[PDB]
Design a protein around this nucleic acid. Structure first.
Lengths: 95, 66, 155
RNA sequence: GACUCGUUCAUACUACAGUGGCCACACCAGAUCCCAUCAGAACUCUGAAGUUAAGCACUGUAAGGCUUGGCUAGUACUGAGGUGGGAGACCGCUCGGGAACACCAGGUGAUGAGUCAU
RNA sequence: GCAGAUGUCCAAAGACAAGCUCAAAGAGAACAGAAAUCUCUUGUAGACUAAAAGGGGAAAAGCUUGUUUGAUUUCUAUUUUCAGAACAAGUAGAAAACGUGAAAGCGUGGCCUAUCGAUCCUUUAUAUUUGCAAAAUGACGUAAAUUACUUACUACUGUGCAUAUAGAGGUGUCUGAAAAGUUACCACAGGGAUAACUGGCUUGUGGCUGCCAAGCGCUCCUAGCGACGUAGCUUUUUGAUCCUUCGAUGUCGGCUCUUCCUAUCAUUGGGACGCAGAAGUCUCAAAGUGUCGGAUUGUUCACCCGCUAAUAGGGAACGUGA
RNA sequence: AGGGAACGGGCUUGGCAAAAUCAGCGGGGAAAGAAGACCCUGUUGAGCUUUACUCUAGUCUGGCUUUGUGAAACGACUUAAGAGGUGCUACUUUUAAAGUUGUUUUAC
RNA sequence: AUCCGACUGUUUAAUUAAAACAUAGCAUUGUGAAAAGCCACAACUGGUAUUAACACAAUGUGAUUUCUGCCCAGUGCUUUGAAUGUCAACUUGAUGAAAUUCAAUCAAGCGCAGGUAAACGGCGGGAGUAACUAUGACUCUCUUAAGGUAGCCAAAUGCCUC
RNA sequence: CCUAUUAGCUGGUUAUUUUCGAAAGAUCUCUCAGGAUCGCUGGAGUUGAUUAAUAUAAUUUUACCAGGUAGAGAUAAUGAUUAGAGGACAGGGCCUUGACCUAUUCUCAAACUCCCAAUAGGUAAAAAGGGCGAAAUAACUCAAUUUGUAUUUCACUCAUAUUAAAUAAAAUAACUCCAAGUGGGCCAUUUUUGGUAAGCAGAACUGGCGAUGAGGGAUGCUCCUAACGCUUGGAUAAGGUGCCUAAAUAUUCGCUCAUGAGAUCCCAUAAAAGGUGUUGGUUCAUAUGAACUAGCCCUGAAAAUGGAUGGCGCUAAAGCGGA
RNA sequence: ACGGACCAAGGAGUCUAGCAAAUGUGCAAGUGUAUAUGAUUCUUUAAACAUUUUACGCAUAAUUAAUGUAAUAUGUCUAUUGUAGAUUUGUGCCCCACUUUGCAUACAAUACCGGUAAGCAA
RNA sequence: GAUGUUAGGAGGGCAAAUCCGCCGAAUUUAAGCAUAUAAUUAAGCGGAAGAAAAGAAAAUAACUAUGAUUCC
RNA sequence: GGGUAAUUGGCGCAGUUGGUUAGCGCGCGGGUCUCAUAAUCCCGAGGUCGUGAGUUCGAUCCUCACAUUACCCA
C-alpha cells in the first residue's frame, strides 16, 4: 500500500474548502501514569491478591488498521482517516 | 449428545394458528427521509394555505361579531 | 454457511439467451408516479441499485422517487405475518406493472357504458360475468363429418 | 426518390451474386489554418476534379441463421385419490394440467417525428 | 455432505473522459525457426477484468492515454442475517466542498456477490462546547477617580486531571473469560440423552446354495469342474446402528448336563461316474444311533501324536459362575 | 407363538387347566445386595505433577534506621588562571589544593 | 535346572508377604561452628549437640567376584569477574512555579566465560565391494554433543512370533 | 460450628367439576441435560361488528408477473464419448502411417443448457377512493407567477334496487397488557442427501403420534374409518358374513390340486433361472408341427424349545380374480 | 426401566423486601400525615381518635457529561392543523341519505423545549 | 532499687442478650474464576455497665447561615 | 515497548572532516631452485532513507534487519 505524502482534499475544520493536506501515519502514543485508568489499575494492583485484571494473550490477527493523520496546510488542524488493514504500508514511496 | 440441528416442521401450523397477519396499511406515511426540497416546499404550500384560509375565516368572524 | 447478498442467484440474475447487454435507451424514458404499482425485476447489467434476491419478480407500489432511484413498498412473508418492506432500487431494476391494466381499462369502459346507460335510463350489470354453464344449442353437422372412434390395438 | 434523429433490436444477422443515381448519402481532391499521428491511414480542417467500384438501397440463393404455424403428442413429465397391480424395480386407473429436441411449411420486416428533391 | 475460497491485495488495480478492440486462426515478409516483430482477412469474446466460484461487461466494465484524489465531512429512508436487536456489508438520497468531461452526466473506493469486532481501559484529534464543588491565575485589560476594600465594561484566562464527539490499539471460541497436565488411590450428582455384552433391524465382511457357459477334462461345455458375469439363503465371524438396560441382566475359557437344527462325518437304503474288481467322487430320502484319548497354550481358534466307523457343522442370552 | 421399548407371569391367538400337602433342587423370576466403582456428562470435587495462571514461607541481594569516636587516600561540586578549536560573548583541557560533598581503606 | 532377590530381617491390621522395603558393601554431595551445614518456630528460641570431618547432614546403588565405556551440546548444579549488557527501591543531577517529567550509577539474578554424567539424561543412516553363490574385512557418502563400548538376550526386556 | 453452604442434576410435590389449550422451530449464549429472546397458549381489557356488509380468507375466477425443477439435448454452447464416410500438413518406401477439415453416428452431466412444464408463489379486481373541471398555496420544478408537480377548497358523478368477479356458522374480528409451559421429538405418504443397507444418519411438504380414547387391521403409540357430555331408537363407515364371531356354508362366472397350496394396505421376506402341470391368447408352416405370450400351480425354497393364513379347519372353498 | 410389603399420623411454591401489571377503593394537580406529639383513652386500648391557615416521598417538565437551559404566544378566557371517528343538532316519536358537532383513539402534519450538527456570530 | 507471713488494701474466676477492643476465614454470588462478594461476618482472645460507646468542634456549610453526642 | 551491540571486499575485521585501508579468497609477473613471498591488481551503496557541515561511511535522525535483559489491565 502506497500513499503520497500530500493530498488536496476537503478541510473539515476552520476551513470548508478543498485545501492541501500533509499526510502522515498516526502513532499510538505512550500511556501516561497519571491517567485515571492507570491510577485506578495501579492502586488495585497494590497489595496482595496477585493479578487483578485480565491479561489478553490470544492475539488472533496479524495486521492493524492504518490511520492517516491529515493536517491542513492552512488552518493546521489535524484530521484522522482510516484505511483498510494491510501488512505492508509505505508513505510516498516510488511510483 | 447429537442434537437435531434443524427442522421447519410445525412452523407453518404455528404461523397459521394466529393467521398470517397483514400490515395495517395506514392512510398517511411519515415523510421523515423522503424527497427534501419537495416536502419542504409542501410544508410552505400548506403553511400558506392555512394562512389564507385562517385569515379569511378571521375576517368573516370579525365582520359577523362586529 | 454461505448467505451472501447474491447467493443462489446463478440463474435468476443471469441474462437471457441472446438478450445480453445493457438496458435499452427507451427504458430511461419510462414515466413513474407516486403510488402506482411497479415490478421489481433485477437487471444484472446494472450492478448499483440492484434489488435483493428475494424481491426479484415481486410487485409493490412506489412510495419514494429520487433522481435515479425508486423506493417501492413490498410485502414480505416472515413466519407468522406479512410485513411491509421499503426496498430502494435504481431505474433499470424497476418496470411499470401491468397488474392494474385490466382494472384501469375496466374502469374507463364501464364509465363510458354507465354514462350511456343512465342517459337511456337502463339497468345494466357492471360486474364481471365469471362465465359458467353454456346454454342449450341446436347444432347441425353433415353426416360425412361424423367419424366413428374406437380404441386402437396395441403394436 | 433521399436524408437526420429514433422505436422494435436478426422476419432486421451472415455469405455469395445482380441492379441503382441529379441534388441526397458516400467514395473522392488537399494539408495553410484548428487539430492529429511513425504514418492527413485514422481524427480535424479546406474543398468539389472524378465515380457508382465500394459504402448505402432493392432483389435473388432447392443459402446458413432467425421467426411464425403445423407436427412431434395428449408422447415425456406432473398436482390430487386409491385397503390399485406388482416381491420389487416400476406400471395402470379416477379427477386434472401438459412439454422439449427433431422434422415439415411459410416468411426475411414493420414503424414515430422532422426535413430535402421532383 | 460435495468442489472450493477468506483473515488479503491496490496512489492505482480508486474517479472521470477520450480513443481503441481482445483470445485465436489463416496467409504473407532478410536474418527469423513451433514459437520473437510487421501487414492483411476472419474473429459474440472463445481474451481481459488482483484473488475462489458464479454472475456482468465490446465505440466496455477490457487495453492505452490525459487530468485527478468522491478511498472527503455531516445526516437520513432503508436491504441482507434477523428477535425483524447489534455489528458488519450494502442500496437510494440530502447538506457542503471538489474531481472529471465540451456537456448531459458520473464519482461517498475497487463491475457484483466474501475480505471482519462490544463494554471497560488506553491513545490522538476537534470544539466562540464544559467541569475539578467558598474563590482567584490572560490582566488592574480598557475608560474615568484619588493616597480607596473607588466605579463601569471586556466571547477569547495557570499546570495537571476529567469529561463530550471521532477514529485507532481486540477479543479468529470471531455478540467478545486472563488459564497446563495426571489419577492404575480416587469422590459426588446424574446419564441407557452415551461406549464396553446379549438381544433387535441391516449384512459390507464370513459361511452356504443357485443361473449362463469361455474353457479344463487325450476327442467331450455340464462324469467331475467351471473363468468372465450374475441371482439368492443364513446370522455359525467381524462389521455398521445406539432401540432396551448405567438406584448393575455377573463380562473369556474349560468342566458338567440336557435339548434342538441339518447345510449328513459315519451308520441305513438308493441314483450317477471319466464305475472291471478294490478304493473313491458327485448326489437323493433320511437327525434313529454315534461323533474319542492325549502333548503345547488361559485360551476360542490352532497344530501335532494316536485310536476310530466317524472322529460333521451349528443353536439354545457367544446355553450353562446363588 | 405373535406383537410390543426389537427376550412376557399378565396383552392377543392357541396348548391347556382339578383340593391340600412332604423332601430335594438350582432352569427362570432379565432373583437378592447397592442411587455402576467401568464409560460419558457436570462450567461438582479431591490427591498428585510441572518450563499451566496468579501468588506465598524460606532464602540471596540493595536502600534507610539502629550507628558512635578518629585518620588517610580517591572522586565529585564550587572558585582563580593557562591552552584548543571558537560567535564583548559561547563550549573542551590543563593548572591550584583554595572552600563544600560523596566513596574506599584503616584505627578505637 | 532356569528366573529374581545376595543372605538374617520388614511390609499393604480385614483380598497382594513378593522379585517390593531394609541391609552390609560401594559412590557422590554439603559443612571448620555459635555470622557453619541440615532442620523446627509467629516471635522468642530450639533439634542434630553430653556433637566436631574416623563427625553430622543429604542422596543414589544394593553381599562377594569381574567391571562400571563415549557425550557438558540440552536442562540442572556450581566457579571467577570493575573488562562486562540488562534492573528495582534509593540516591544524584537537569528542567519547571511546583506536582511531575527527564537523565546517571559498583547489588543480587540472568546473560558472558568455565567445571561437572556413581547430576537428570543421551549414546545414527545410506550405498558399493573378495577366483563359485552368499556375506562384506575394505571403500565412498550423509550426519551427531556423543553415535550403545565391555557385555547380555525372543530374558519378568523381541511386537513380527507359536 | 460457618450451614438449612451450592447443585444448569435425580426423586417427590396433597380436593371436584367446567372452559380454553401448547411446544419439541428460531436467534444469541464457555452454549449442546441450561438460559434469555421470538414463535405457539391462557387470562384481562378496550376498540369494533352486531346492518346475510365491509374489514377478512392456508379457496377459486379474471388480468398481469417471476422462475429453470421434472422432462428434452448432445448435430445448440461447455464438459465428456463410440464408430466409421468423404476431402488439399508431418514420416518412410505412385503407395503406406496418421494428423487435420466437412457431413454423419452410439451414449452421458448435482456443481451443463437452445427450450421448458405440473405444482408452488406474487400483485390487482373502486367510496378516507376514482374520474372530470375551475380557483387558490409554494421557497419545489420548468424556458414558463402560470410549464408541471403536490396540497387545499369548491363543483359535476362513478354499479350499490344482489352488493365495481365467485364463495364464505367472514367480527369467533383488530389491538393492548400480564403471564404459564415449551425450546431432547418421533412416525406415515411423497421428494431427497450420505450409506451396501438398516426399525441407520440428515433434510422438504402435509397429516398424525406426542397430548387421544372409539370401530376395524387376531395382536400393535403412528395404518383404515373416525376423533369422545349422558341416553333411547334408526341407519351406516372401515371391515366383514363356515365356526370361534354379529352377519351369506348367498347368488353368478372363470382359475387352481400343492408328498411343506393359498388366503385383507402398513405387514411381518423372497429372486435370477426353469416345467411336456393346466388355462387362455399371438404369429408362422398341410389338424397336425413349431415359436412365443401370461394366469394359477410346481422346482428353485435349509436352523436351531413345539407352532401358527389369529385358531379350527377349508378343495361342488371357507383359496385366487371378478360380478 | 426405576420407587412402592401393609396401615396410621406427619409431609412440600410459603414469609419478607423491592418493582411492575391487573382489578377494587378513597381523594385528585395533588396525594400519603413519616417520626413525633394531645387527649377525662388506658381490661379490651399494642387500637381507635386528632394534628394553630412552605417537614419528607412520589407526582406536577424535560433535556444535557456539563456551566446549565427549559415547552404555540399576547395577536386571544382564543385553548395548533388535517383524514377517519363516538355523541349531539336539524331536513327528507320508530330506516337511511344530506347537513351540525368532532370525545377517545389511530395515522400524519405542524409549531415549541433540551442536546448535537450546519450557517452567522460583539 | 531490693527484701520483708511488717499495717491496710486491690486484681484473678463465673456469667453475655445488649456493649467495648483485637484477631480473622471459607462456604456462597459472579451461572467458570483469580480482584470483588460473602464480610470489616462466623469461629478465636481480651474488657465493662444497667445500659456500654459517643460527646462539648482543629464540625458543617457557602446560606438571610447552623452549633456537643446518641437515636428515630 | 524500554536499554545495549552488530552487520565495510567473497571471509572475517578494526579504523572516523582535507582518507575506503589491510590479512585471508582471486589473477599474472617475478622469485631462492619446489613452496614462501616484495609488489600490482579482482573484491567496498562503510546495511537502508533523510538531515547537519570551507572540509563526512563518519556528525544527527528515522525505517526494517540480529542477539542477552526487561515490561507485558482493552
Amino acid at each position: 500500500v502506497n500513499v503520497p505524502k500530500t493530498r488536496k482534499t476537503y478541510c473539515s475544520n476552520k476551513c470548508k474548502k478543498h485545501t492541501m493536506h500533509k499526510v502522515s501515519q498516526y502513532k499510538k502514543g505512550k500511556e501516561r501514569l497519571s491517567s485515571l485508568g492507570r491510577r485506578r489499575y495501579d492502586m488495585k494492583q497494590k497489595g496482595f491478591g496477585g493479578q487483578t485484571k485480565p491479561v489478553f494473550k490470544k492475539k488472533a490477527k496479524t495486521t492493524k488498521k492504518i490511520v492517516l493523520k491529515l493536517e491542513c496546510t492552512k488552518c493546521k488542524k489535524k484530521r484522522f482517516q482510516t484505511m483498510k488493514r494491510c501488512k505492508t504500508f509505505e508513505m510516498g514511496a516510488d511510483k | 449428545a447429537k442434537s437435531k440441528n434443524h427442522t421447519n416442521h410445525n412452523q407453518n401450523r404455528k404461523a397459521h394458528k394466529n393467521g398470517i397477519k397483514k400490515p395495517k396499511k395506514h392512510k398517511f406515511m411519515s415523510r421523515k427521509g423522503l424527497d427534501p426540497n419537495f416536502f419542504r416546499n409542501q410544508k410552505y404550500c400548506l403553511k400558506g394555505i392555512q394562512k389564507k384560509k385562517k385569515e379569511l375565516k378571521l375576517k368573516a368572524k370579525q365582520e359577523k361579531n362586529n | 454457511k454461505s448467505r451472501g447478498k447474491r447467493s443462489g442467484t446463478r440463474y435468476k440474475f443471469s441474462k437471457k439467451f441472446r438478450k445480453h447487454g445493457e438496458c435499452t435507451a427507451n427504458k430511461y424514458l419510462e414515466k413513474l408516479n407516486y403510488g402506482d404499482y411497479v415490478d421489481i425485476v433485477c437487471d444484472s447489467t446494472q450492478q448499483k441499485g440492484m434489488p435483493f434476491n428475494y424481491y426479484h419478480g415481486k410487485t409493490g407500489k412506489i412510495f419514494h422517487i429520487t433522481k435515479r432511484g425508486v423506493g417501492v413498498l413490498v410485502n414480505k412473508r416472515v413466519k407468522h405475518r406479512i410485513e411491509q418492506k421499503k426496498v430502494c432500487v435504481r431505474i433499470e431494476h424497476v418496470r411499470k406493472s401491468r397488474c392494474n391494466e385490466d382494472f384501469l381499462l375496466r374502469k374507463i369502459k364501464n364509465a363510458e357504458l354507465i354514462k350511456e346507460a343512465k342517459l337511456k335510463n337502463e339497468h345494466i350489470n357492471i360486474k364481471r360475468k365469471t362465465e359458467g354453464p353454456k346454454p342449450a344449442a341446436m347444432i347441425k353437422v353433415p353426416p360425412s363429418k361424423i367419424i366413428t372412434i374406437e380404441p386402437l390395438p396395441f403394436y
